[PDB]
Amino acid sequence: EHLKREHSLIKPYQGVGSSSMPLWDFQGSTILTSQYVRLTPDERSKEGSIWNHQPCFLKDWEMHVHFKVHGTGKKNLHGDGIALWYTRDRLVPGPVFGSKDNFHGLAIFLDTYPNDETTERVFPYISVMVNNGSLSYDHSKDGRWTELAGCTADFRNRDHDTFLAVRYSRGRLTVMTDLEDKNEWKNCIDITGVRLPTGYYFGASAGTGDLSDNHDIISMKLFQLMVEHTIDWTKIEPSVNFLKS
Ligand SMILES: [Ca+2]
Ligand SMILES: [Cl-]
Ligand SMILES: [Cl-]
Ligand SMILES: [Cl-]
Ligand SMILES: [Cl-]
Ligand SMILES: [Cl-]
Ligand SMILES: [Cl-]
């Protein structure tokens, strides 16, 4: 296998009911059960996260997340969503799906609720953001101003398992979904020129406001990609290069 166990969360969770080294720190509203990590309960005004206990120095990787978002809210009344992170800092709660704003690195947002009254998107909506510390995620507008790419995605209250994959290698960032019980990865996002350093932390977070949902992480499995390279990679500033019009 090219599984990197130390950057993964897999049942039975390491160090849970044992003297073993835990591989994750659990923060905020997060609660830990034998069959899932629940970042937030279906309760209002919650912020919870899980952060890999050590930084990841892989240059080429692919993270598979088995998650579940589910709740009893009537009509459209649920929120806020989950964020997956590969960032400089860790463990700090905030308004960005339970984690700090003005972050450094990569976010993948699984946004369940249209905060934006004049949105032109259909929700839930998965998108990516790359940040150098300067940008704020505008939650009130579902991050309209800072979205690199995204896709609509039906992932709440499904009768079968839902998964997400995030692959990063040689500047190419690909997000794929498996939401329709097809045992297939469907493309959501595929962009190039994404610059990220090594030495950042994997984490996941969720938040709730006046609207809520259960936001569960079942597993996160990080794979090392065997990719050739021919620079101090820890000093790369998070950024994106853009093909000219
Ligand atoms: Ca939203
Ligand atoms: Cl684990
Ligand atoms: Cl509540
Ligand atoms: Cl924004
Ligand atoms: Cl929905
Ligand atoms: Cl379904
Ligand atoms: Cl899908």
mmCIF file with all atom_site columns, all heavy atoms in Angstrom, residues 105-106 128-130 148 168-174 189-197 236-242:
data_model
loop_
_atom_site.group_PDB
_atom_site.id
_atom_site.type_symbol
_atom_site.label_atom_id
_atom_site.label_alt_id
_atom_site.label_comp_id
_atom_site.label_asym_id
_atom_site.label_entity_id
_atom_site.label_seq_id
_atom_site.pdbx_PDB_ins_code
_atom_site.Cartn_x
_atom_site.Cartn_y
_atom_site.Cartn_z
_atom_site.occupancy
_atom_site.B_iso_or_equiv
_atom_site.pdbx_formal_charge
_atom_site.auth_seq_id
_atom_site.auth_comp_id
_atom_site.auth_asym_id
_atom_site.auth_atom_id
_atom_site.pdbx_PDB_model_num
ATOM 1   N N   . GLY A 1 105 ? -2.973  28.243 3.153   1.00 0.00 ? 105 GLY A N   1
ATOM 2   C CA  . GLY A 1 105 ? -3.001  26.928 2.534   1.00 0.00 ? 105 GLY A CA  1
ATOM 3   C C   . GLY A 1 105 ? -4.302  26.709 1.781   1.00 0.00 ? 105 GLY A C   1
ATOM 4   O O   . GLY A 1 105 ? -4.897  27.647 1.222   1.00 0.00 ? 105 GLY A O   1
ATOM 5   N N   . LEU A 1 106 ? -4.746  25.471 1.794   1.00 0.00 ? 106 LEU A N   1
ATOM 6   C CA  . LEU A 1 106 ? -5.846  25.014 0.947   1.00 0.00 ? 106 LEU A CA  1
ATOM 7   C C   . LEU A 1 106 ? -7.065  24.656 1.778   1.00 0.00 ? 106 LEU A C   1
ATOM 8   O O   . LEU A 1 106 ? -6.942  24.044 2.822   1.00 0.00 ? 106 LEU A O   1
ATOM 9   C CB  . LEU A 1 106 ? -5.376  23.774 0.164   1.00 0.00 ? 106 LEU A CB  1
ATOM 10  C CG  . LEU A 1 106 ? -6.459  22.945 -0.518  1.00 0.00 ? 106 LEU A CG  1
ATOM 11  C CD1 . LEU A 1 106 ? -7.004  23.725 -1.739  1.00 0.00 ? 106 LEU A CD1 1
ATOM 12  C CD2 . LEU A 1 106 ? -5.925  21.565 -0.937  1.00 0.00 ? 106 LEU A CD2 1
ATOM 13  N N   . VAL A 1 128 ? -13.142 25.112 -3.740  1.00 0.00 ? 128 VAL A N   1
ATOM 14  C CA  . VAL A 1 128 ? -11.805 25.166 -3.182  1.00 0.00 ? 128 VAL A CA  1
ATOM 15  C C   . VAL A 1 128 ? -11.337 26.629 -3.070  1.00 0.00 ? 128 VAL A C   1
ATOM 16  O O   . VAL A 1 128 ? -11.738 27.489 -3.856  1.00 0.00 ? 128 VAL A O   1
ATOM 17  C CB  . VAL A 1 128 ? -10.786 24.336 -3.991  1.00 0.00 ? 128 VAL A CB  1
ATOM 18  C CG1 . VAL A 1 128 ? -11.050 22.810 -3.843  1.00 0.00 ? 128 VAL A CG1 1
ATOM 19  C CG2 . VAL A 1 128 ? -10.773 24.759 -5.470  1.00 0.00 ? 128 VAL A CG2 1
ATOM 20  N N   . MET A 1 129 ? -10.456 26.866 -2.115  1.00 0.00 ? 129 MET A N   1
ATOM 21  C CA  . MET A 1 129 ? -9.900  28.188 -1.876  1.00 0.00 ? 129 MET A CA  1
ATOM 22  C C   . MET A 1 129 ? -8.419  27.994 -1.484  1.00 0.00 ? 129 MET A C   1
ATOM 23  O O   . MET A 1 129 ? -8.084  27.066 -0.760  1.00 0.00 ? 129 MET A O   1
ATOM 24  C CB  . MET A 1 129 ? -10.718 28.875 -0.778  1.00 0.00 ? 129 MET A CB  1
ATOM 25  C CG  . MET A 1 129 ? -10.190 30.226 -0.320  1.00 0.00 ? 129 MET A CG  1
ATOM 26  S SD  . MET A 1 129 ? -11.338 30.906 0.883   1.00 0.00 ? 129 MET A SD  1
ATOM 27  C CE  . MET A 1 129 ? -10.532 32.485 1.224   1.00 0.00 ? 129 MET A CE  1
ATOM 28  N N   . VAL A 1 130 ? -7.547  28.833 -2.020  1.00 0.00 ? 130 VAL A N   1
ATOM 29  C CA  . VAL A 1 130 ? -6.133  28.850 -1.652  1.00 0.00 ? 130 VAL A CA  1
ATOM 30  C C   . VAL A 1 130 ? -5.858  30.229 -1.039  1.00 0.00 ? 130 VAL A C   1
ATOM 31  O O   . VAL A 1 130 ? -6.276  31.247 -1.596  1.00 0.00 ? 130 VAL A O   1
ATOM 32  C CB  . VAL A 1 130 ? -5.239  28.551 -2.869  1.00 0.00 ? 130 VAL A CB  1
ATOM 33  C CG1 . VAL A 1 130 ? -3.740  28.718 -2.523  1.00 0.00 ? 130 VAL A CG1 1
ATOM 34  C CG2 . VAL A 1 130 ? -5.500  27.115 -3.344  1.00 0.00 ? 130 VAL A CG2 1
ATOM 35  N N   . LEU A 1 148 ? -12.079 29.374 -6.148  1.00 0.00 ? 148 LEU A N   1
ATOM 36  C CA  . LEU A 1 148 ? -11.262 29.060 -7.318  1.00 0.00 ? 148 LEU A CA  1
ATOM 37  C C   . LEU A 1 148 ? -12.049 28.289 -8.374  1.00 0.00 ? 148 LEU A C   1
ATOM 38  O O   . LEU A 1 148 ? -11.913 28.542 -9.579  1.00 0.00 ? 148 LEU A O   1
ATOM 39  C CB  . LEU A 1 148 ? -10.024 28.256 -6.915  1.00 0.00 ? 148 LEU A CB  1
ATOM 40  C CG  . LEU A 1 148 ? -8.934  29.029 -6.164  1.00 0.00 ? 148 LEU A CG  1
ATOM 41  C CD1 . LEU A 1 148 ? -7.808  28.069 -5.869  1.00 0.00 ? 148 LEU A CD1 1
ATOM 42  C CD2 . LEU A 1 148 ? -8.416  30.201 -6.996  1.00 0.00 ? 148 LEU A CD2 1
ATOM 43  N N   . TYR A 1 168 ? -3.563  16.136 -4.892  1.00 0.00 ? 168 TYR A N   1
ATOM 44  C CA  . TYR A 1 168 ? -2.653  17.235 -5.139  1.00 0.00 ? 168 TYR A CA  1
ATOM 45  C C   . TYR A 1 168 ? -1.304  16.705 -5.572  1.00 0.00 ? 168 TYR A C   1
ATOM 46  O O   . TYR A 1 168 ? -0.608  16.015 -4.810  1.00 0.00 ? 168 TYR A O   1
ATOM 47  C CB  . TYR A 1 168 ? -2.543  18.160 -3.909  1.00 0.00 ? 168 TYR A CB  1
ATOM 48  C CG  . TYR A 1 168 ? -1.619  19.334 -4.181  1.00 0.00 ? 168 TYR A CG  1
ATOM 49  C CD1 . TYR A 1 168 ? -1.958  20.298 -5.145  1.00 0.00 ? 168 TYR A CD1 1
ATOM 50  C CD2 . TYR A 1 168 ? -0.394  19.445 -3.529  1.00 0.00 ? 168 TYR A CD2 1
ATOM 51  C CE1 . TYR A 1 168 ? -1.098  21.365 -5.441  1.00 0.00 ? 168 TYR A CE1 1
ATOM 52  C CE2 . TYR A 1 168 ? 0.480   20.504 -3.819  1.00 0.00 ? 168 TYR A CE2 1
ATOM 53  C CZ  . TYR A 1 168 ? 0.112   21.465 -4.755  1.00 0.00 ? 168 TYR A CZ  1
ATOM 54  O OH  . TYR A 1 168 ? 0.960   22.506 -5.044  1.00 0.00 ? 168 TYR A OH  1
ATOM 55  N N   . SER A 1 169 ? -0.920  17.043 -6.800  1.00 0.00 ? 169 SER A N   1
ATOM 56  C CA  . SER A 1 169 ? 0.371   16.611 -7.307  1.00 0.00 ? 169 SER A CA  1
ATOM 57  C C   . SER A 1 169 ? 0.819   17.468 -8.501  1.00 0.00 ? 169 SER A C   1
ATOM 58  O O   . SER A 1 169 ? 0.051   17.702 -9.455  1.00 0.00 ? 169 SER A O   1
ATOM 59  C CB  . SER A 1 169 ? 0.295   15.117 -7.690  1.00 0.00 ? 169 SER A CB  1
ATOM 60  O OG  . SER A 1 169 ? 1.505   14.707 -8.314  1.00 0.00 ? 169 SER A OG  1
ATOM 61  N N   . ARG A 1 170 ? 2.052   17.961 -8.410  1.00 0.00 ? 170 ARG A N   1
ATOM 62  C CA  . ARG A 1 170 ? 2.646   18.772 -9.462  1.00 0.00 ? 170 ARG A CA  1
ATOM 63  C C   . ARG A 1 170 ? 1.735   19.943 -9.850  1.00 0.00 ? 170 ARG A C   1
ATOM 64  O O   . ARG A 1 170 ? 1.495   20.209 -11.026 1.00 0.00 ? 170 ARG A O   1
ATOM 65  C CB  . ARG A 1 170 ? 2.990   17.879 -10.666 1.00 0.00 ? 170 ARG A CB  1
ATOM 66  C CG  . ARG A 1 170 ? 4.083   16.829 -10.363 1.00 0.00 ? 170 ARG A CG  1
ATOM 67  C CD  . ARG A 1 170 ? 4.392   15.981 -11.641 1.00 0.00 ? 170 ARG A CD  1
ATOM 68  N NE  . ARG A 1 170 ? 5.067   16.798 -12.652 1.00 0.00 ? 170 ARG A NE  1
ATOM 69  C CZ  . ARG A 1 170 ? 6.385   16.987 -12.726 1.00 0.00 ? 170 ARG A CZ  1
ATOM 70  N NH1 . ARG A 1 170 ? 7.216   16.369 -11.888 1.00 0.00 ? 170 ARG A NH1 1
ATOM 71  N NH2 . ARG A 1 170 ? 6.876   17.783 -13.671 1.00 0.00 ? 170 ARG A NH2 1
ATOM 72  N N   . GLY A 1 171 ? 1.210   20.636 -8.845  1.00 0.00 ? 171 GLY A N   1
ATOM 73  C CA  . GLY A 1 171 ? 0.402   21.832 -9.096  1.00 0.00 ? 171 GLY A CA  1
ATOM 74  C C   . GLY A 1 171 ? -1.035  21.560 -9.496  1.00 0.00 ? 171 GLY A C   1
ATOM 75  O O   . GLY A 1 171 ? -1.812  22.488 -9.639  1.00 0.00 ? 171 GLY A O   1
ATOM 76  N N   . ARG A 1 172 ? -1.370  20.296 -9.721  1.00 0.00 ? 172 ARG A N   1
ATOM 77  C CA  . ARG A 1 172 ? -2.737  19.927 -10.147 1.00 0.00 ? 172 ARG A CA  1
ATOM 78  C C   . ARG A 1 172 ? -3.528  19.528 -8.912  1.00 0.00 ? 172 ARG A C   1
ATOM 79  O O   . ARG A 1 172 ? -3.108  18.662 -8.143  1.00 0.00 ? 172 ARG A O   1
ATOM 80  C CB  . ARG A 1 172 ? -2.708  18.764 -11.152 1.00 0.00 ? 172 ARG A CB  1
ATOM 81  C CG  . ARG A 1 172 ? -4.067  18.429 -11.701 1.00 0.00 ? 172 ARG A CG  1
ATOM 82  C CD  . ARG A 1 172 ? -3.936  17.270 -12.702 1.00 0.00 ? 172 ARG A CD  1
ATOM 83  N NE  . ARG A 1 172 ? -5.253  16.792 -13.123 1.00 0.00 ? 172 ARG A NE  1
ATOM 84  C CZ  . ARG A 1 172 ? -5.426  15.818 -14.016 1.00 0.00 ? 172 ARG A CZ  1
ATOM 85  N NH1 . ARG A 1 172 ? -4.373  15.226 -14.554 1.00 0.00 ? 172 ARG A NH1 1
ATOM 86  N NH2 . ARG A 1 172 ? -6.649  15.427 -14.365 1.00 0.00 ? 172 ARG A NH2 1
ATOM 87  N N   . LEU A 1 173 ? -4.650  20.210 -8.721  1.00 0.00 ? 173 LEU A N   1
ATOM 88  C CA  . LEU A 1 173 ? -5.609  19.900 -7.653  1.00 0.00 ? 173 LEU A CA  1
ATOM 89  C C   . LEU A 1 173 ? -6.912  19.385 -8.231  1.00 0.00 ? 173 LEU A C   1
ATOM 90  O O   . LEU A 1 173 ? -7.555  20.083 -9.012  1.00 0.00 ? 173 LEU A O   1
ATOM 91  C CB  . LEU A 1 173 ? -5.881  21.177 -6.851  1.00 0.00 ? 173 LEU A CB  1
ATOM 92  C CG  . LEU A 1 173 ? -6.861  21.042 -5.697  1.00 0.00 ? 173 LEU A CG  1
ATOM 93  C CD1 . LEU A 1 173 ? -6.330  20.130 -4.597  1.00 0.00 ? 173 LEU A CD1 1
ATOM 94  C CD2 . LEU A 1 173 ? -7.151  22.450 -5.172  1.00 0.00 ? 173 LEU A CD2 1
ATOM 95  N N   . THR A 1 174 ? -7.293  18.175 -7.822  1.00 0.00 ? 174 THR A N   1
ATOM 96  C CA  . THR A 1 174 ? -8.490  17.497 -8.339  1.00 0.00 ? 174 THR A CA  1
ATOM 97  C C   . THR A 1 174 ? -9.359  17.104 -7.159  1.00 0.00 ? 174 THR A C   1
ATOM 98  O O   . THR A 1 174 ? -8.870  16.494 -6.214  1.00 0.00 ? 174 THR A O   1
ATOM 99  C CB  . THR A 1 174 ? -8.140  16.202 -9.144  1.00 0.00 ? 174 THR A CB  1
ATOM 100 O OG1 . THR A 1 174 ? -7.101  16.474 -10.078 1.00 0.00 ? 174 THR A OG1 1
ATOM 101 C CG2 . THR A 1 174 ? -9.388  15.700 -9.918  1.00 0.00 ? 174 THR A CG2 1
ATOM 102 N N   . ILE A 1 189 ? -13.827 19.175 -9.426  1.00 0.00 ? 189 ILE A N   1
ATOM 103 C CA  . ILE A 1 189 ? -12.880 20.264 -9.679  1.00 0.00 ? 189 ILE A CA  1
ATOM 104 C C   . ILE A 1 189 ? -11.612 19.673 -10.270 1.00 0.00 ? 189 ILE A C   1
ATOM 105 O O   . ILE A 1 189 ? -11.157 18.591 -9.834  1.00 0.00 ? 189 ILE A O   1
ATOM 106 C CB  . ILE A 1 189 ? -12.533 20.992 -8.344  1.00 0.00 ? 189 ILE A CB  1
ATOM 107 C CG1 . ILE A 1 189 ? -13.748 21.789 -7.828  1.00 0.00 ? 189 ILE A CG1 1
ATOM 108 C CG2 . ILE A 1 189 ? -11.244 21.860 -8.479  1.00 0.00 ? 189 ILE A CG2 1
ATOM 109 C CD1 . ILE A 1 189 ? -13.720 21.982 -6.311  1.00 0.00 ? 189 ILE A CD1 1
ATOM 110 N N   . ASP A 1 190 ? -11.042 20.342 -11.272 1.00 0.00 ? 190 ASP A N   1
ATOM 111 C CA  . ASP A 1 190 ? -9.710  19.959 -11.776 1.00 0.00 ? 190 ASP A CA  1
ATOM 112 C C   . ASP A 1 190 ? -8.995  21.227 -12.240 1.00 0.00 ? 190 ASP A C   1
ATOM 113 O O   . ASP A 1 190 ? -9.309  21.766 -13.302 1.00 0.00 ? 190 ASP A O   1
ATOM 114 C CB  . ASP A 1 190 ? -9.826  18.951 -12.942 1.00 0.00 ? 190 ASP A CB  1
ATOM 115 C CG  . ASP A 1 190 ? -8.660  17.948 -12.996 1.00 0.00 ? 190 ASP A CG  1
ATOM 116 O OD1 . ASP A 1 190 ? -7.642  18.105 -12.300 1.00 0.00 ? 190 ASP A OD1 1
ATOM 117 O OD2 . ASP A 1 190 ? -8.774  16.955 -13.751 1.00 0.00 ? 190 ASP A OD2 1
ATOM 118 N N   . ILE A 1 191 ? -8.055  21.712 -11.448 1.00 0.00 ? 191 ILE A N   1
ATOM 119 C CA  . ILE A 1 191 ? -7.361  22.965 -11.776 1.00 0.00 ? 191 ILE A CA  1
ATOM 120 C C   . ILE A 1 191 ? -5.850  22.761 -11.657 1.00 0.00 ? 191 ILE A C   1
ATOM 121 O O   . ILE A 1 191 ? -5.400  21.807 -11.021 1.00 0.00 ? 191 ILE A O   1
ATOM 122 C CB  . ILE A 1 191 ? -7.844  24.129 -10.873 1.00 0.00 ? 191 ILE A CB  1
ATOM 123 C CG1 . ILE A 1 191 ? -7.633  23.807 -9.404  1.00 0.00 ? 191 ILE A CG1 1
ATOM 124 C CG2 . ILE A 1 191 ? -9.327  24.507 -11.189 1.00 0.00 ? 191 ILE A CG2 1
ATOM 125 C CD1 . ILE A 1 191 ? -7.875  25.014 -8.485  1.00 0.00 ? 191 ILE A CD1 1
ATOM 126 N N   . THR A 1 192 ? -5.081  23.623 -12.316 1.00 0.00 ? 192 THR A N   1
ATOM 127 C CA  . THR A 1 192 ? -3.635  23.528 -12.281 1.00 0.00 ? 192 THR A CA  1
ATOM 128 C C   . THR A 1 192 ? -3.021  24.868 -11.824 1.00 0.00 ? 192 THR A C   1
ATOM 129 O O   . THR A 1 192 ? -3.742  25.855 -11.639 1.00 0.00 ? 192 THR A O   1
ATOM 130 C CB  . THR A 1 192 ? -3.075  23.139 -13.682 1.00 0.00 ? 192 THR A CB  1
ATOM 131 O OG1 . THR A 1 192 ? -3.528  24.106 -14.634 1.00 0.00 ? 192 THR A OG1 1
ATOM 132 C CG2 . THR A 1 192 ? -3.575  21.725 -14.092 1.00 0.00 ? 192 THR A CG2 1
ATOM 133 N N   . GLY A 1 193 ? -1.712  24.865 -11.613 1.00 0.00 ? 193 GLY A N   1
ATOM 134 C CA  . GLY A 1 193 ? -0.991  26.067 -11.144 1.00 0.00 ? 193 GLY A CA  1
ATOM 135 C C   . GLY A 1 193 ? -1.205  26.378 -9.664  1.00 0.00 ? 193 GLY A C   1
ATOM 136 O O   . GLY A 1 193 ? -0.961  27.514 -9.221  1.00 0.00 ? 193 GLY A O   1
ATOM 137 N N   . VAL A 1 194 ? -1.643  25.381 -8.898  1.00 0.00 ? 194 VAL A N   1
ATOM 138 C CA  . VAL A 1 194 ? -1.833  25.528 -7.440  1.00 0.00 ? 194 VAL A CA  1
ATOM 139 C C   . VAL A 1 194 ? -0.488  25.259 -6.745  1.00 0.00 ? 194 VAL A C   1
ATOM 140 O O   . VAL A 1 194 ? 0.092   24.165 -6.875  1.00 0.00 ? 194 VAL A O   1
ATOM 141 C CB  . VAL A 1 194 ? -2.958  24.563 -6.932  1.00 0.00 ? 194 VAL A CB  1
ATOM 142 C CG1 . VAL A 1 194 ? -3.114  24.584 -5.422  1.00 0.00 ? 194 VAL A CG1 1
ATOM 143 C CG2 . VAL A 1 194 ? -4.276  24.880 -7.593  1.00 0.00 ? 194 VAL A CG2 1
ATOM 144 N N   . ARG A 1 195 ? 0.014   26.268 -6.026  1.00 0.00 ? 195 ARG A N   1
ATOM 145 C CA  . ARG A 1 195 ? 1.299   26.162 -5.332  1.00 0.00 ? 195 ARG A CA  1
ATOM 146 C C   . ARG A 1 195 ? 1.041   26.046 -3.836  1.00 0.00 ? 195 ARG A C   1
ATOM 147 O O   . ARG A 1 195 ? 0.411   26.918 -3.240  1.00 0.00 ? 195 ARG A O   1
ATOM 148 C CB  . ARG A 1 195 ? 2.203   27.378 -5.618  1.00 0.00 ? 195 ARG A CB  1
ATOM 149 C CG  . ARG A 1 195 ? 2.562   27.636 -7.082  1.00 0.00 ? 195 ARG A CG  1
ATOM 150 C CD  . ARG A 1 195 ? 3.721   26.697 -7.550  1.00 0.00 ? 195 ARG A CD  1
ATOM 151 N NE  . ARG A 1 195 ? 5.075   26.893 -6.957  1.00 0.00 ? 195 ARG A NE  1
ATOM 152 C CZ  . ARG A 1 195 ? 5.594   28.014 -6.411  1.00 0.00 ? 195 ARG A CZ  1
ATOM 153 N NH1 . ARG A 1 195 ? 4.914   29.137 -6.334  1.00 0.00 ? 195 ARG A NH1 1
ATOM 154 N NH2 . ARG A 1 195 ? 6.833   28.008 -5.930  1.00 0.00 ? 195 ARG A NH2 1
ATOM 155 N N   . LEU A 1 196 ? 1.484   24.931 -3.258  1.00 0.00 ? 196 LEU A N   1
ATOM 156 C CA  . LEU A 1 196 ? 1.376   24.697 -1.816  1.00 0.00 ? 196 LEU A CA  1
ATOM 157 C C   . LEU A 1 196 ? 2.682   24.111 -1.305  1.00 0.00 ? 196 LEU A C   1
ATOM 158 O O   . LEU A 1 196 ? 3.310   23.259 -1.990  1.00 0.00 ? 196 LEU A O   1
ATOM 159 C CB  . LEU A 1 196 ? 0.212   23.722 -1.485  1.00 0.00 ? 196 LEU A CB  1
ATOM 160 C CG  . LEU A 1 196 ? -1.220  24.126 -1.895  1.00 0.00 ? 196 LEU A CG  1
ATOM 161 C CD1 . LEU A 1 196 ? -2.192  22.917 -1.935  1.00 0.00 ? 196 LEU A CD1 1
ATOM 162 C CD2 . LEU A 1 196 ? -1.757  25.228 -0.925  1.00 0.00 ? 196 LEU A CD2 1
ATOM 163 N N   . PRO A 1 197 ? 3.101   24.550 -0.098  1.00 0.00 ? 197 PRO A N   1
ATOM 164 C CA  . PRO A 1 197 ? 4.317   23.998 0.498   1.00 0.00 ? 197 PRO A CA  1
ATOM 165 C C   . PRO A 1 197 ? 4.062   22.637 1.129   1.00 0.00 ? 197 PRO A C   1
ATOM 166 O O   . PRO A 1 197 ? 2.928   22.250 1.359   1.00 0.00 ? 197 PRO A O   1
ATOM 167 C CB  . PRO A 1 197 ? 4.643   25.020 1.586   1.00 0.00 ? 197 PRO A CB  1
ATOM 168 C CG  . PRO A 1 197 ? 3.292   25.480 2.043   1.00 0.00 ? 197 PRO A CG  1
ATOM 169 C CD  . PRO A 1 197 ? 2.470   25.552 0.790   1.00 0.00 ? 197 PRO A CD  1
ATOM 170 N N   . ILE A 1 236 ? 7.369   27.314 0.103   1.00 0.00 ? 236 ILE A N   1
ATOM 171 C CA  . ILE A 1 236 ? 6.512   27.703 -1.009  1.00 0.00 ? 236 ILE A CA  1
ATOM 172 C C   . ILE A 1 236 ? 5.345   28.526 -0.447  1.00 0.00 ? 236 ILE A C   1
ATOM 173 O O   . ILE A 1 236 ? 4.698   28.096 0.484   1.00 0.00 ? 236 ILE A O   1
ATOM 174 C CB  . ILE A 1 236 ? 5.992   26.438 -1.773  1.00 0.00 ? 236 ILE A CB  1
ATOM 175 C CG1 . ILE A 1 236 ? 7.164   25.716 -2.470  1.00 0.00 ? 236 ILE A CG1 1
ATOM 176 C CG2 . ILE A 1 236 ? 4.931   26.828 -2.787  1.00 0.00 ? 236 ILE A CG2 1
ATOM 177 C CD1 . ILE A 1 236 ? 6.831   24.325 -3.009  1.00 0.00 ? 236 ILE A CD1 1
ATOM 178 N N   . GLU A 1 237 ? 5.105   29.718 -0.987  1.00 0.00 ? 237 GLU A N   1
ATOM 179 C CA  . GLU A 1 237 ? 3.953   30.526 -0.544  1.00 0.00 ? 237 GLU A CA  1
ATOM 180 C C   . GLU A 1 237 ? 2.689   29.984 -1.205  1.00 0.00 ? 237 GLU A C   1
ATOM 181 O O   . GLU A 1 237 ? 2.678   29.771 -2.433  1.00 0.00 ? 237 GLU A O   1
ATOM 182 C CB  . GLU A 1 237 ? 4.131   31.997 -0.898  1.00 0.00 ? 237 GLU A CB  1
ATOM 183 C CG  . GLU A 1 237 ? 5.313   32.681 -0.183  1.00 0.00 ? 237 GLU A CG  1
ATOM 184 C CD  . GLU A 1 237 ? 5.518   34.127 -0.655  1.00 0.00 ? 237 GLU A CD  1
ATOM 185 O OE1 . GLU A 1 237 ? 4.504   34.785 -1.004  1.00 0.00 ? 237 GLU A OE1 1
ATOM 186 O OE2 . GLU A 1 237 ? 6.693   34.595 -0.694  1.00 0.00 ? 237 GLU A OE2 1
ATOM 187 N N   . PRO A 1 238 ? 1.630   29.751 -0.406  1.00 0.00 ? 238 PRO A N   1
ATOM 188 C CA  . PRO A 1 238 ? 0.376   29.286 -1.032  1.00 0.00 ? 238 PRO A CA  1
ATOM 189 C C   . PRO A 1 238 ? -0.117  30.295 -2.043  1.00 0.00 ? 238 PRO A C   1
ATOM 190 O O   . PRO A 1 238 ? -0.284  31.496 -1.725  1.00 0.00 ? 238 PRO A O   1
ATOM 191 C CB  . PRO A 1 238 ? -0.603  29.182 0.140   1.00 0.00 ? 238 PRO A CB  1
ATOM 192 C CG  . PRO A 1 238 ? 0.248   29.007 1.315   1.00 0.00 ? 238 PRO A CG  1
ATOM 193 C CD  . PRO A 1 238 ? 1.500   29.806 1.067   1.00 0.00 ? 238 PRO A CD  1
ATOM 194 N N   . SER A 1 239 ? -0.359  29.826 -3.265  1.00 0.00 ? 239 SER A N   1
ATOM 195 C CA  . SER A 1 239 ? -0.836  30.730 -4.310  1.00 0.00 ? 239 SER A CA  1
ATOM 196 C C   . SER A 1 239 ? -1.342  29.937 -5.505  1.00 0.00 ? 239 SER A C   1
ATOM 197 O O   . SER A 1 239 ? -1.272  28.703 -5.515  1.00 0.00 ? 239 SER A O   1
ATOM 198 C CB  . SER A 1 239 ? 0.273   31.711 -4.750  1.00 0.00 ? 239 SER A CB  1
ATOM 199 O OG  . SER A 1 239 ? 1.286   31.052 -5.507  1.00 0.00 ? 239 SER A OG  1
ATOM 200 N N   . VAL A 1 240 ? -1.884  30.659 -6.489  1.00 0.00 ? 240 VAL A N   1
ATOM 201 C CA  . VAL A 1 240 ? -2.309  30.014 -7.723  1.00 0.00 ? 240 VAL A CA  1
ATOM 202 C C   . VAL A 1 240 ? -1.785  30.802 -8.928  1.00 0.00 ? 240 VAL A C   1
ATOM 203 O O   . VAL A 1 240 ? -1.908  32.017 -8.965  1.00 0.00 ? 240 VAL A O   1
ATOM 204 C CB  . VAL A 1 240 ? -3.862  29.849 -7.785  1.00 0.00 ? 240 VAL A CB  1
ATOM 205 C CG1 . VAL A 1 240 ? -4.274  29.070 -9.078  1.00 0.00 ? 240 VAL A CG1 1
ATOM 206 C CG2 . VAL A 1 240 ? -4.379  29.109 -6.535  1.00 0.00 ? 240 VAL A CG2 1
ATOM 207 N N   . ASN A 1 241 ? -1.184  30.106 -9.887  1.00 0.00 ? 241 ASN A N   1
ATOM 208 C CA  . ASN A 1 241 ? -0.830  30.705 -11.170 1.00 0.00 ? 241 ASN A CA  1
ATOM 209 C C   . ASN A 1 241 ? -1.966  30.442 -12.160 1.00 0.00 ? 241 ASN A C   1
ATOM 210 O O   . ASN A 1 241 ? -2.501  29.328 -12.217 1.00 0.00 ? 241 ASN A O   1
ATOM 211 C CB  . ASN A 1 241 ? 0.468   30.106 -11.721 1.00 0.00 ? 241 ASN A CB  1
ATOM 212 C CG  . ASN A 1 241 ? 1.644   30.293 -10.779 1.00 0.00 ? 241 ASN A CG  1
ATOM 213 O OD1 . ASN A 1 241 ? 1.744   31.314 -10.117 1.00 0.00 ? 241 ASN A OD1 1
ATOM 214 N ND2 . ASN A 1 241 ? 2.552   29.311 -10.734 1.00 0.00 ? 241 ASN A ND2 1
ATOM 215 N N   . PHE A 1 242 ? -2.289  31.461 -12.948 1.00 0.00 ? 242 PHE A N   1
ATOM 216 C CA  . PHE A 1 242 ? -3.430  31.429 -13.867 1.00 0.00 ? 242 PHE A CA  1
ATOM 217 C C   . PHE A 1 242 ? -3.044  31.515 -15.337 1.00 0.00 ? 242 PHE A C   1
ATOM 218 O O   . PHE A 1 242 ? -2.354  32.450 -15.765 1.00 0.00 ? 242 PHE A O   1
ATOM 219 C CB  . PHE A 1 242 ? -4.393  32.559 -13.552 1.00 0.00 ? 242 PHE A CB  1
ATOM 220 C CG  . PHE A 1 242 ? -4.980  32.475 -12.179 1.00 0.00 ? 242 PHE A CG  1
ATOM 221 C CD1 . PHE A 1 242 ? -4.412  33.166 -11.132 1.00 0.00 ? 242 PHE A CD1 1
ATOM 222 C CD2 . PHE A 1 242 ? -6.101  31.681 -11.934 1.00 0.00 ? 242 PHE A CD2 1
ATOM 223 C CE1 . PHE A 1 242 ? -4.950  33.089 -9.824  1.00 0.00 ? 242 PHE A CE1 1
ATOM 224 C CE2 . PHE A 1 242 ? -6.658  31.598 -10.637 1.00 0.00 ? 242 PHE A CE2 1
ATOM 225 C CZ  . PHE A 1 242 ? -6.082  32.291 -9.594  1.00 0.00 ? 242 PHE A CZ  1
#
